[PDB]
Ligand binder design. Structure first.
Ligand SMILES: Cc1cc2nc3c(=O)[nH]c(=O)nc-3n(C[C@H](O)[C@H](O)[C@H](O)COP(=O)(O)O)c2cc1C
Ligand SMILES: Cc1cc2nc3c(=O)[nH]c(=O)nc-3n(C[C@H](O)[C@H](O)[C@H](O)COP(=O)(O)O)c2cc1C
Ligand SMILES: Cc1cc2nc3c(=O)[nH]c(=O)nc-3n(C[C@H](O)[C@H](O)[C@H](O)COP(=O)(O)O)c2cc1C
Ligand SMILES: Cc1cc2nc3c(=O)[nH]c(=O)nc-3n(C[C@H](O)[C@H](O)[C@H](O)COP(=O)(O)O)c2cc1C
Ligand SMILES: CN(C)c1noc(-c2cccc(CNc3ccc4n[nH]c(C(=O)O)c4c3)c2O)n1
Ligand SMILES: CN(C)c1noc(-c2cccc(CNc3ccc4n[nH]c(C(=O)O)c4c3)c2O)n1
Ligand SMILES: CN(C)c1noc(-c2cccc(CNc3ccc4n[nH]c(C(=O)O)c4c3)c2O)n1
Ligand SMILES: CN(C)c1noc(-c2cccc(CNc3ccc4n[nH]c(C(=O)O)c4c3)c2O)n1
Lengths: 336, 336, 336, 336
């Protein structure tokens, strides 16, 4: 059990208990961290226009992601090597997701195997985040493992031909196959739409393009037969000076013309952030850093607590805005 | 008698004399308090365009609220359990309103009975703020008591299906029928326009919808036969990230097409704030926190002093803007 | 002779040598001082678009105010009771204006008589600032004295039916006929366009309306046969929350359609401020507080130094913007 | 070899090792330094819209400046008297440019002769920055020396009829022919388009107009047969309150209608700044202060390190934005 009542409290506690180099690795954005600040600031510029007297006695937060039911439109995003935050790492995370009835996106650079996570969370909704590695044999092996171990989708990260320049990591230096050296050597900078065609042919699993920021790229992902877009700037860790994901979301929703689900990550810290993303047409949002702060506090119980805080904040935001369920969250609730 | 010459001085004095938990309860907004800051910041963005050489020798501040004459378009808003600020609580407040010739809105969660307040301020203009409680029998009893004890209107609060998440109250924990537990258990989250129809049938008293932020909700309140709209975000204590009330006011005034009076609360601290609200079409404004700071300073004399400061600031703002009376305050005085 | 090289240096020195109550009286704006900050901030939002390769070898700063030649479009504005800043007060100021070849506007609430100032600066361009006092006999006497003693215009202040609420003056409490009490008792709040008609009939001297912020009021001043508009918010000391004078200037210039000269005061501290005001169509600007800071430093020599700093800054701003004289300063030099 | 990993680190190190008066001379902008702050802030307002899945395995940074190949669109701008920063001054700078395969613009107020710099960097791409001095004989001699010693262009500075007012230089006081006195006496304030005609007739070398901020001036430079425009506010050291160069660039690119190359300097500190300038139509950018900070750290090795940091940041920005070469950097990558 100190008393942590919002996501910011979990971050402040994590700073107090993590070694500075580990806290800095988790916290940091690219270069001058303009986008890191904007992912949060942009949510505040979108104002809520709540409806009164709707009857919100029995708020229902449940929705579906790529045809699978979830308890809430708030899911765990991929964050590499969770065992740095807590000894149980990804196993703690999947156990919390199982408890909450939400989905976990497992990093393909995890400190737990695809099989181990599936064995720890057999009833959990689980997706695999994938890089198309220079080694296409190990890429293929991960997708086959995901299929065999009951994972329900592939999130292919498309914004990382190279790793971003996070200054604190350079100052501090530095389980399915840790230093930026070895990761940089593994990731293929040549990845093209031809490689998306190869991945689409490799699996019948739903594939989501993670890291799209342009309407024209979203349209190309639909044309390649992908099943969703995760509007993401990689938590502002790749190219600094890109827009906030909440500011780009409306463009992407407009561009895909309802053909695939659109998701958002980047800067989600509060229930009102979730409400604004759904009002602008996202099906669900993903959280990265909040999950790591949960792990740092108390492993599985810490992740469960973070997810329960976001769930309760989202329920209250829905109720106060006059929304009894996610289907009645509409564009007129928000204006910038 | 320290020397307090503006409303901010009263707040700073209240911080110095109140226990931190009580000051924090009064001061706080919801969650990250974005709207709390914006209720004040938004007034500064509206600029005044004063007329010169009008003859403002005999400035007349008097107006009417729902057909009842008042000395100034500045009235006391509902604030629960005033006896926390001063031993005399609501009785101090109503005695000050009687002295000033303005109206008092009594919280239905007051530390003085409807009868006690009416006995302390028999000549005061008095209104009852109402929640539609899960217990409709006690709701009915309050309205009947208001009628019998010479209250002139019902302000039905419509923005509180649940209580907002004020973080300091969670950190500090915690007379007509005190802990958020007991209040949360009393308030009905199922309240709908059907319950407004029931209230409209229950009383011939004028009814004002308190907490409307959307033009479409304002139009529905007119269609239900209500007699006014109080444009309010509950002092930024309910849903955080809603607009400032002064920014929403023009939309609501436009939407009701002169069919009912429109009032404002939220962030009123200065005479120029009152002038801007009337220029944008509000009939009168309500003050919440300033009254509590008055009580904390010196009970009845403190409330009288706060109200006299706002009156004098408003008279000077009117005179310097070329307005001899409230009927000549027009839209051309302000631009954002 | 410390080394003061810009107007801000003179203010910082004045703070160091004046009693706090006197510094605060000079520095202060009305209420929360929003307009005080904006008079300066607004100049920074107007950006300069300099022309290159014009030939600025022999920059000529000279212009005319109401038909009288001046060395530069930078004149001394009225500031009451200059003897608080320096023993020589208004006599020091007029001697500096005589040296510079610019005009002095004498406050009608001066610590030197109209005759004394005329005797100290017989060759100086001198104007009288006038309030229409409740006592019209003493108002008439001031205008007749101005005429007899070789003053070239009347600036009638029209934004002061009452004195503004400057909070520091209230905290600190407190020669042609000192406490706000006595000044408040002297100034007529009934002044109307009828009183402007009376003043226009009283003198053939040029009359400038000082304190106009609306185009419609500027047009009425032209219709009443006045000879100029001084766009002024009284150094942000009257109604707080009015716009910056530089932001209102274009509206007023447009409204008078070239029929009378338009002047500006409020926030002029730098040569680029003068250039921006002339680019937006002002004939000349007036400085209030900078002159008091000059007096506080070294009386006549201090005022001369402040005026010489503004002159040199303005010459450099003209030269770097490609303007050899004031007639070639045009609207295309600035954009907001 | 402290560990400096970005340009800001080099500045902070230079502040620690340079005498305050020298650091202040290098750092300072004109007057209140509004433009100094805006040259940097303006880059942050331009947001990047990266393309994904392009194949950026073999990023090629090479381009051409005025027909000469360079390794990257990042060149060294003219900064007077580099020997104040390091004993080797301009010879250190040209040796670093030779190593990098980029161009050096040599100040005509250098602490090394045109011949000495050419002898130190015989293989380096070298340009001469020129003032048209009151002494046209020495102006002619510099151009003839540039021609003879294998310099490939003249950058004629057109924004300096007089030197800007940098306040710190006034507080601190103070090799082809040091005090502002002697420089002020040398520079001709009469320079006109007639003098540009004279310079165009004097040399067949390409001539770039350095310091243009207006589209109409850019068009006149094209009409006079000049070969490029360097959009520059002289590192915010001349007229304060001009726009940021990145904000003026689109106007200038539009105005010249592809007739000549357009370059930018002012506020370039990061690879994303270079990318934004090229996306808005600049051929290349110049850096001033970063080179001086390199010299202050470790002479030639320090300049090489600064240039290598900008090169690597630019390569990563190109790769993450989906640009394999400079020819595919287009207007759709940026929005303000
Ligand atoms: C420490 C850390 C590790 C991450 N690792 C990965 C990863 O392995 N794969 C991936 O696609 N994204 C990764 N991301 C990006 C996240 O999936 C996600 O886009 C981001 O955290 C969302 O922003 P938020 O942290 O503001 O919630 C990582 C982010 C962080 C902070
Ligand atoms: C301490 C406190 C108690 C309040 N209690 C009530 C209440 O019982 N009923 C109600 O309708 N509104 C209540 N409000 C909201 C106020 O009526 C009013 O909308 C708000 O205070 C106006 O904003 P201001 O405080 O900035 O003037 C309360 C506000 C505060 C700060
Ligand atoms: C201390 C002080 C005294 C003033 N006295 C007068 C006055 O007697 N009459 C008047 O018309 N304006 C008066 N003003 C307003 C000034 O004439 C002028 O509008 C203002 O100072 C311009 O702004 P600035 O101080 O930013 O230059 C006064 C201003 C100050 C600061
Ligand atoms: C210390 C210093 C000396 C300079 N000397 C010259 C010069 O001799 N000639 C010239 O044309 N520009 C000169 N400049 C302006 C630069 O060429 C260039 O426009 C400016 O430094 C670009 O901005 P940045 O410093 O933000 O990169 C100088 C700038 C600085 C900071
Ligand atoms: C003091 N620490 C822990 C430290 N300093 O630098 C590093 C570090 C540097 C590079 C890579 C890793 C871990 N592996 C991966 C693998 C794939 C990824 N995709 N996105 C990210 C991301 O961090 O945004 C990824 C990280 C690191 O842990 N760690
Ligand atoms: C340390 N104190 C005094 C503390 N901490 O938490 C609480 C508290 C929490 C919940 C409720 C109350 C009081 N009752 C009500 C009743 C109706 C209301 N309508 N609006 C409000 C509001 O506060 O905005 C209302 C408050 C409280 O006093 N008090
Ligand atoms: C500690 N001091 C010096 C102090 N505190 O309060 C006061 C004071 C208060 C009221 C009036 C005066 C002086 N008389 C006038 C007369 C006409 C004016 N027109 N504009 C102004 C202005 O100040 O903006 C005027 C001031 C004061 O000096 N002085
Ligand atoms: C403590 N130092 C070094 C100091 N204080 O003032 C000065 C100084 C003042 C004036 C001139 C110089 C050097 N000569 C030149 C020559 C041509 C130039 N073109 N642009 C600039 C610029 O600085 O922006 C130029 C500077 C100075 O070094 N130096």
């Amino acid at each position: 059990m100190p008393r942590l009542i919002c996501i910011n409290d979990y971050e402040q506690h994590a700073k107090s208990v993590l070694p500075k180099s580990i806290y800095d690795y988790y916290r940091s954005g690219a270069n001058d961290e303009e986008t890191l600040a904007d992912n949060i600031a942009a949510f505040s510029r979108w104002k809520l226009y709540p409806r009164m007297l709707r009857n919100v006695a029995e708020t229902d937060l449940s929705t579906s992601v790529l045809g699978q039911r979830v308890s809430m439109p708030i899911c765990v995003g991929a964050t590499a090597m969770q065992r740095m935050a807590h000894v149980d790492g990804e196993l703690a995370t999947v156990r919390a997701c199982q408890s909450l009835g939400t989905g976990m996106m497992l990093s393909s650079w995890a400190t737990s195997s695809i099989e181990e996570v599936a064995e720890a969370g057999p009833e959990a909704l689980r997706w695999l985040q994938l890089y198309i590695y220079k080694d296409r044999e190990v890429t293929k092996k991960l997708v086959r493992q995901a299929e065999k171990m009951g994972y329900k989708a592939i999130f292919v990260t498309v914004d990382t031909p190279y790793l971003g320049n996070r200054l604190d990591d350079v100052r501090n230096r530095f389980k399915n196959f840790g230093l930026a050296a070895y990761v940089a050597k593994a990731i293929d900078p040549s990845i093209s739409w031809e490689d998306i065609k190869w991945l689409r042919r490799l699996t019948s699993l739903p594939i989501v393009a993670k890291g799209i920021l342009r309407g024209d790229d979203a349209r190309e992902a639909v044309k390649h037969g992908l099943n969703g877009i995760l509007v993401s700037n990689h938590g502002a860790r790749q190219l600094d000076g890109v827009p906030a994901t909440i500011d780009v979301l409306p463009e992407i929703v407009e561009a895909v013309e309802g053909k695939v689900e659109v998701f958002l990550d980047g800067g989600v810290r509060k229930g009102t952030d979730v409400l604004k993303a759904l009002a602008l047409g996202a099906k669900a949002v993903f959280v990265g850093r909040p999950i790591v702060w949960g792990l740092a506090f108390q492993g599985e119980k810490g992740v469960q607590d973070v997810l329960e805080i976001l769930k309760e904040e989202f329920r209250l935001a829905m109720a106060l805005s006059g929304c009894q369920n996610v289907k009645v969250i509409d564009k007129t609730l928000v204006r910038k």
